[PDB]
Point group: C4
Amino acid sequence: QNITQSWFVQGMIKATTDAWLKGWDERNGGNLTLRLDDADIAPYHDNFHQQPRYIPLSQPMPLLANTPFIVTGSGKFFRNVQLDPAANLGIVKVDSDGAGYHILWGLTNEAVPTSELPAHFLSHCERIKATNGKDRVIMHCHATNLIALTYVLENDTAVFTRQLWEGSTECLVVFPDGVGILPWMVPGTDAIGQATAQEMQKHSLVLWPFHGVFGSGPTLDETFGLIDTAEKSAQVLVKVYSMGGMWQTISREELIALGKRFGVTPLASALA
Amino acid sequence: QNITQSWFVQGMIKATTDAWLKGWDERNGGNLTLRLDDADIAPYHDNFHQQPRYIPLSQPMPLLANTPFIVTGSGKFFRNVQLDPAANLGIVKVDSDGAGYHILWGLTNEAVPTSELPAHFLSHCERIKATNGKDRVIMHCHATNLIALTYVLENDTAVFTRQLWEGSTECLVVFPDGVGILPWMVPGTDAIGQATAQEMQKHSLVLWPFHGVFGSGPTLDETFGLIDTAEKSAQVLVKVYSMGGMWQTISREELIALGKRFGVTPLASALA
Amino acid sequence: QNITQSWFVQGMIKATTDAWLKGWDERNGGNLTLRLDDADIAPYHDNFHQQPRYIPLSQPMPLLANTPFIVTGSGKFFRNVQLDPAANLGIVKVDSDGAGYHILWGLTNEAVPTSELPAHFLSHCERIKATNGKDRVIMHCHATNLIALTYVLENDTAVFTRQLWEGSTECLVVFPDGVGILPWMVPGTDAIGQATAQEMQKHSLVLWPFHGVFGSGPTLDETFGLIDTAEKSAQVLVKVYSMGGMWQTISREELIALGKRFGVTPLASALA
Amino acid sequence: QNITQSWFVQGMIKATTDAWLKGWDERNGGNLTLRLDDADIAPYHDNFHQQPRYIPLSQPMPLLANTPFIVTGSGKFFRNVQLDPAANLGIVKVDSDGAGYHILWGLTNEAVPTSELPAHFLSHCERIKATNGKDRVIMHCHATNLIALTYVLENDTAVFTRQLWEGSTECLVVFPDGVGILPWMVPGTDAIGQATAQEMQKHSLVLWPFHGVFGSGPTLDETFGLIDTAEKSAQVLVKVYSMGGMWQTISREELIALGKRFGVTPLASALA
Ligand SMILES: [Zn+2]
Ligand SMILES: [Zn+2]
Ligand SMILES: [Zn+2]
Ligand SMILES: [Zn+2]
Ligand SMILES: [Zn+2]
Ligand SMILES: [Zn+2]
Ligand SMILES: [Zn+2]
Ligand SMILES: [Zn+2]
Ligand SMILES: [Zn+2]
Ligand SMILES: [Zn+2]
Ligand SMILES: [Zn+2]
Ligand SMILES: [Zn+2]
C-alpha cells in the first residue's frame, strides 16, 4: 500500500470528512488527533520518504514518550482531507523524553500539526490514565447546536448534562459522566489545553462555550458517535426550545432506571 | 454473485444509508430487520462460509419458525453498513420451534443482531397477523422532528395523529391508522418489545417518546417512505410551531373527504 | 445510446434527484412531466422494445395531440429514479385526438404515469397558451418551507407573493407574476387539476396549501430553479418569523425599482 | 491536460459546487471571480480553440489591465458547473487599457460573464490595493442565515459585526475588520458595484441586505472559508434568537483578549 490506504489514514479521512458534511467544521475549525501503535505504522515505513522535522512540546509529556499519532494540520480544512491526506494530515511521533515530536509523514509544504495540539496531547494523557489506555482519540469540532445551546442554557455541567440526557434517550448511556463545561477561554493556549485536560479526567465530553466541543473515545467511530449523540440531542433541544419548551420529558426516575439497566453510573449531580 | 450484490443486501445498504443521511441514526441509534423468503437466500447459499451460531430467543415465537431475516447488528452504525455489509448486517434464520435463531451470514467478529431484536421479532409477528403476511420490514430510527414533537405535543395517539395528518396532506392516506404513542420505557427490554408489538396491532407507526419511531411496511422503500412521510410532516409542524402556531390548517371535513377519495378508513378518534 | 443517456432522461434523473436531496419529495410525493419534441425521441426509437399501452384521458386535450412527454410514474419515489429510470419514468405520447396517450417506454411492470397527471397535462395546456409554447415543464414537489408558510401566512396571493418577494431580492425578477394560492383540495382529482391549470394562466407558481407547490418553466433547470427560488425565500422567511419577525425589509419602492431595472411587470396587487 | 483538470478550473468547480451544496446558490444566484496569473493559463493555451470575444467594461479599470480571471457566467447555475465547466465558466483577460476584456475560453453558446461583474472587478481593484495584491477572489453567494439576520438585526456594521463575532469564537480572528453592510440596492448596477467596492476598502465581507454576501480572500478555499465562518456564526445566531436570545455570550474583554492573542486589530467600533 499506500499509507493513504491504511486503516488510520482512511479513518481520518472518513471522519474529518463526516464532521465537515455535518456542518461542524467551517474553514479550519476543529481538529482530530488519533493515538496509534508502532505496529500500525510499521508496515508502511517505506512511505516515510522525507526527513522527520522536530517540534518541541510546550510542556513535557512523558506519558506520551515514543508514541505515534496521526493528526490534522494547523490551518487545514476538514473538507480538504479527502482530497489530499498528505497535505492535510501528519503522522507524528513523540520523542523518548516526551519533550517534543517528529513529523514522520504528511503535513507537506512546511505545514505543522493543529495549534490545539496542547488541548489534544494533554487530554490524551488524562484519557489514557482515566481509561487505562482504552481511549485513543481526541476530536474537537464546532458542533452547531451544542454551540447554540451554550448561549441559552445555564453553563452548569449538571444542568447542561441533564438537558442533553433528556434530549435523546440514549444520551445517559453513551455519556453517563456528562459534559464538562469550561468558562470561555482564549483558544490555542496552554491554559485552555490544561483546563480541557483537567475536565477530561471527569467526562469524555468537554464544551467550549461559544466555540465547540471536545470528545474522547477508543476509536474514531466511537468518538465521532459520542459527539454526534450529544449534538443530535442538542439539535432536538434547540427545536424544543424554539417551540417554547418542554411540556413533558424523561423523568429523573426514568433516567435512573435507564442507567441501572445499561450498567452505567450516571453523574449524580445531574439527577436532581 | 456476491450476496452483497443481492437485492436484500443492497436494500439494507440503501436504507440504513438513507436513514443516516437524513440525520436519523447517530452512532448505533436505530435498527432495521427485513423478513425474507427461503427463495431469496437460496441462490446465494455458497456465500454462507462460516458455521451458523445459535442464539436463543427471549420468548418463543412459533409464527416465525424457519423464517429468514436480514438484520442490522448490535452496536453497529447505520453509516458503516455501506462500507462493510458483512460486518454490520447478518442474515439469521429462526429455528423450527421459533425458540431461537441461527446467524447464517455476516455479523463478523462475534457481532450479534440488534439488541432491539424483541421489539423487532414481536412486531413482525403482529404485523404478519395484522396484514395477512404483507408486512416484511420493521424499521426503527431516531427521526429528529418526531422526537422533538414528543416533548411538545400531547402524548395522545389521537391528537398526535391529527397534527401529523394536518402537517402534510398525504399523511392521512399513508397512515390512516395513525401513530401509536407509548409511554417512555427502558429500551432493549422485553417489556418495550411487547408494548411496541401490541401497538403494531393497531398502527403501522409507533412512537417512543424522547427516543424515536418504529414503522412497519411491506418493502424497505415503503417502510422508509412511511417513516419519512411522518417525519416530513413533523418537520413542517416544528417550523409552524416555531413560528407561533397554525392560523389555518386542513379541516376535519377536508381530512374526511380525503380519506373517502383514497379509499382508506382514518382513525376515527383523531377526527374531532 | 441508451435512451437512458439521452438529455431528457438524464434531465429527469438530475432533477427528481435534486428535488429528493432538497427534502422536497418524501416517499412518492411530487411529480415531474416534461414536454418533448418528436425530434428528441426519434434518434432513440429502437429503444422502444415493448408494445405501447394506451390509457384514455379523463378529459380531451386537443392542444396536446401527438405530443410526447417524459413523466414520473404513479407511486414512484423521486429517490429511485437515478437507480432505475425505466422503472420510475415513462415516455408517453398523447394520441392524435388528444383523447388519451400511449406509453412508449418505461414504467415497467405495469406502472402508469403520475396520478396528478390532470394537474400536469391541463397546466401544460395553459402554460403553452400563456407562453406561446415556451414552457415545457410542470413540476410538483413538497417544498418544505413553502408548505410550512401556508399554515402561518394569509392564504392570499398578494400577501403571500409580497412576503416571498421580500424574502430574497431576486424573487420579484424570477416570479414577477407571483404565486397563485388555491384553497385546500383533494389531490389527484380533475377539480384540483382544473383549479391549478386556471391559476397557471396567471402565475408560473401555484401553491397547494398544506401540500406543496406546482411550478412551470421552459426547461427542467429553469423550472427547478423557479421553485428553488420561492422555497429559498420561504426558508429565509421561516427563519425570520421564527426569530419574531422583520424589523426591516425590502420596501415597496425598492421592489418597484427592482422590477423596472429588470424589465418585468410585477403583480400590482402585491405592491401595497 | 485538459484545462478542465487545471487547478483553477477544478478550484471553481469545488467551490461553486460547495456553495450549491450549502444551499447558498439557488438557481443562478451568486457569482465567483478568481484573479489568475498569465503563468496559470499559459501551459493550457492550446485549449483556447475559439476566437476571443471582446466585451467593453462599463467603466475603465487600468489596475486590471492584461489581467486574466476565471469567472462564473451570467444566468448560470452553480449546481451545473461540475457537470459542464466550459458551459458555465469563462476565462477572460482584461485588455491593456483596462477598458474591456476578451473571453478566451468557455462561456460556450454566446454566454457571458456574470452580470455582477462590476461589483466583482471593482472590488478586486480595491482588494488588490487594500491587501497589496494578496486577495485574488471575489465570491458572492446567497448565504441563508446571514440573509435572514438582515431582516432582524440592526443593519449597522458595528452591531452586526459584534453579533457575528459573538456567534462563534473564531469570527473575530477570521474577520477582525468586520462586515460592511450596504443599504438595499438594485443588483447588477454600477451603483451597487461602486458601493460594494468602497466597502471592500474596509472589510473583507460586505452584506447586501435581503440578498446575500460578498467576500474577498487570497484563495478560493480562504474566501469560501471566510464566508462559511460568517454564515456558521449567522446559523448559530438564528438558532439562539429563535430560542429567545442570549443569556450569556463572549464579553467585550474576551473579544479584546482574543484579538491580542491572535495578533489582529478588531474593528474598534464593534467593541462597545
Ligand atoms: Zn475550535
Ligand atoms: Zn522497508
Ligand atoms: Zn467537570
Ligand atoms: Zn433507538
Ligand atoms: Zn451450492
Ligand atoms: Zn394504539
Ligand atoms: Zn403532492
Ligand atoms: Zn431504427
Ligand atoms: Zn391567481
Ligand atoms: Zn445575488
Ligand atoms: Zn501550444
Ligand atoms: Zn464599512
